[PDB]
Design a protein around this nucleic acid. Structure first.
Ligand SMILES: [Mn+2]
Ligand SMILES: [Mn+2]
Length: 692
DNA sequence: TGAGGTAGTAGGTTGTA
DNA sequence: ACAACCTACTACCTC
């Protein structure tokens, strides 16, 4: 029942390692000299900014004379030598893995033999290794993944009667620098560049999108391993590598958390507020009323294809909606359908979805001041000829500020299939008697979260707060910052889950410049002042503390934050959230000799921690940890971890728990929606989440 | 696009005594 | 050039 992490700390120390340093007379310095020495002398090496470090003397120098040669230790007070030693240790590990163990260096990983073969698709194993120096100690971390390839090359396809597309993606698999694009010549293009070489080298690219069906099923079955198999296969190769490595020594069992220095904490599930205290969200939603009800005016957008290509009539659509209005009335929410849709009856045909741009302008007054319930076939939404989803969002959210919920034909087909399979198909809706039986039937199957998620989307897009946290957080205000790349121009977002119980109060785009992952000083100051003013508008006071959650690495300027929060006399903390730590944590059970994972587990060391926030099934995979880093110091770090974990139970748009806290999960979605132009910055309203 | 989860693929991207 | 995150897409199973 011990706690295991994919890391190990060496018995040796950073300044106890004897190394050889060569100093020679751009960041690409002494690299060709490194390659020459590597080929000539057959020993691991590393370089950093015109300096080479080795573990053994270099006999042959290939006619190169270093300015200085030294046999010394590292200066731990200088991070330069720390980085150089880290690179040397990683290179030595790679060198020792390639020999004695038959490993290749492919891409960014180490290809490790073949594990599966699925109808001319080869699956290899692979591993990543990382070296860090923390307080005169060396820590090695490692992560196991997979790799895909096709057996046949383009040479085997030019013959045997097979064709080639003019511009399909092909791969030239070489050593560590693989690209993406008889003995016939194949002309290929990359970026803006034309070239050609032998067809035997190139192979077709292996991705999920391009693989034929009946292959994705089995590939997914192989590459979705449980906790036990993943952890065992990860530790077996590292134990194999320890035998051949002798520059550093480790413990007999280096993989526990005591040997790594972490300490263990176990958090608890917060209480949620549905007009009372509820243990879980599901319990509150099944048998409880909302925290803040109200009235909703819904409208209907129905396309004729439901009747033309499928067998769904408008009567069935209104029968489905009548079920929604009956579940909602039991939660304090009253929904009414606008009657303006009758004047535009018979519209929304194929021609309408082909000339949407011309036809939508006169359709605005019908759907004004309502929450649209679009009923569109998935073909229209997906087809690139129409692209109806993007245009609908751009014209309803990006203009006219109208919230809309989209439903495809698959949901209605599943609902109708379940309706037929349980009888009671004769009548529904009116007379308010068959609706109760329909709800009773629905409540005992898996098609209950679909209806509830549709309802939750409607509520949240129409200004309703389903529930909040029943206990206030340690801090009084949370500000979440997120950015998106989108291959060039970058859109960002600063948002407020400020309330100690959980309430959107304001959202704000970081449209101005921002280049990439950098917020201008004036922009940051103005946004912080706007956020604090927005908090002053509510609660009629100022917060005693503020916590700033940042998606990624905190690359901003701390002096401005300190000055601004000192002007208003508020304490502040800055926390980095890392959602891809590339580490795995698990509990080992010796009685059954198996691995497991528990939600709300924290491994903390110094001002860094790993948090477990999800509980996936065996066939879904193994839980992904979250890395929490504290940049400043004003509160205990355990309080920071507890607040981060608590703020993730606020997935008010879905009954399924999200891994990340609300400050990040509602910021990335907002940034993504704003980048595509589905939200206008004129309003920036509170408690409304059209993008959610 | 009912939503979440995890896990492959391809590319940015900022800092470097 | 090396590290360590980030972005986007696709696929499946769960509720
Ligand atoms: Mn994001
Ligand atoms: Mn949605």
């Amino acid at each position: 029942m011990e706690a295991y992490i994919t890391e190990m700390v060496s018995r040796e120390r950073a300044n106890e390692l004897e190394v050889y340093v060569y100093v020679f007379p751009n960041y690409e310095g002494v690299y060709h000299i490194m390659r020459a020495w590597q080929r000539a002398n057959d020993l691991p090496l590393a370089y950093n900014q015109h300096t080479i470090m080795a573990f053994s003397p270099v006999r042959h120098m290939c006619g190169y004379t270093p300015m200085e040669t030294q046999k010394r230790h590292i200066n731990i007070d200088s991070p330069f030598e720390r980085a150089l030693l880290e690179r040397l240790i990683k290179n030595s590990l790679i060198f020792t893995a390639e020999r004695h163990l038959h490993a290749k260096r492919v891409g960014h990983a180490l290809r490790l033999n073949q594990v599966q073969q699925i109808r001319q698709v080869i699956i290899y194993e692979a591993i990543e290794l990382y070296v860090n120096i923390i307080e005169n100690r060396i820590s090695i971390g490692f992560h196991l993944t997979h790799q895909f390839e096709y057996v046949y090359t383009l040479q085997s396809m030019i013959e045997q009667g097979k064709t080639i597309r003019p511009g399909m993606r092909v791969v030239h698999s070489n050593g560590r620098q693989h690209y993406t694009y008889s003995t016939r010549v194949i002309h290929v293009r990359t970026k803006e560049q034309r070239l050609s070489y032998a067809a035997t080298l190139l192979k077709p690219l292996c991705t999920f999108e391009t693989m034929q069906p009946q292959d994705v099923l089995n590939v997914s079955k192989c590459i979705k391993l449980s906790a036990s198999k993943r952890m065992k296969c990860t530790y077996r190769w590292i134990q194999q590598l320890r035998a051949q490595y002798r520059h550093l020594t480790f413990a007999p069992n280096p993989f526990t958390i005591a040997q790594n220095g972490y300490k263990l904490d176990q958090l608890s599930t917060p209480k949620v507020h549905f007009h009372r205290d509820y243990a879980t969200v599901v319990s509150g939603m099944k048998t409880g009323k909302l925290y803040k009800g109200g009235n909703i005016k819904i409208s209907v957008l129905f396309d004729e294809d439901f009747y033309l290509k499928h067998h769904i009539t408008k009567k069935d659509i209104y029968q489905f909606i009548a079920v929604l209005q009956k579940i909602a009335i039991a939660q304090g929410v009253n929904m009414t359908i606008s009657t303006s849709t009758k004047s535009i009856t018979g519209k929304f045909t194929d021609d309408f979805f082909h000339h949407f741009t011309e036809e939508v302008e006169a359709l605005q007054p019908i759907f004004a001041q309502t929450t649209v319930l679009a009923f569109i076939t998935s073909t229209h939404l997906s087809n690139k000829k129409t692209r109806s989803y993007q245009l609908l969002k751009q014209y309803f959210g990006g203009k006219w500020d109208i919230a809309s919920q989209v439903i495809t034909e698959k949901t209605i087909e599943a609902f109708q299939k379940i309706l037929h399979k349980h009888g009671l198909k004769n009548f529904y809706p009116n007379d308010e008697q068959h609706c109760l039986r329909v709800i009773d039937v629905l409540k005992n199957e898996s098609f209950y979260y679909t209806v509830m998620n549709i309802l939750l989307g409607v509520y949240v897009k129409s200004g309703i707060q389903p529930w909040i946290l029943a206990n206030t957080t340690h801090s009084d205000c949370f500000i979440g910052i997120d950015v998106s790349h989108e291959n060039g121009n970058s859109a960002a977002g600063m948002m407020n889950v400020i309330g100690s119980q959980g309430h959107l109060i304001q959202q704000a785009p970081l449209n101005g410049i921002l280049a990439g992952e950098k917020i201008d000083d004036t922009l940051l100051a103005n946004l912080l002042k706007q956020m604090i003013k927005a908090y002053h508008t509510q609660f009629q006071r100022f917060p005693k503390h503020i916590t700033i959650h940042r998606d990624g690495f905190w690359r901003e300027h701390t002096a401005l934050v300190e000055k601004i929060m000192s002007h208003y006399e508020i304490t502040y903390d800055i926390v980095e959230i890392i959602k891809k730590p590339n580490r795995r944590m698990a509990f080992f059970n010796s009685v059954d000799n198996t691995f497991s994972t528990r939600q709300g587990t924290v491994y903390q060391r110094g001002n860094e921690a790993f948090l477990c926030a999800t509980n996936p099934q065996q066939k879904v995979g193994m839980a992904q940890p979250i890395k929490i880093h504290q940049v400043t110091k004003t509160l205990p770090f355990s309080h920071i971890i507890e607040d981060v974990y608590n703020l993730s139970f606020l997935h008010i748009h879905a009954m399924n728990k999200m891994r990340l806290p609300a400050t990040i999960h509602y910021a990335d979605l907002s940034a993504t929606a704003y980048q595509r132009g589905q939200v206008m910055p004129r309003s920036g309203n509170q408690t409304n989440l059209p993008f959610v």
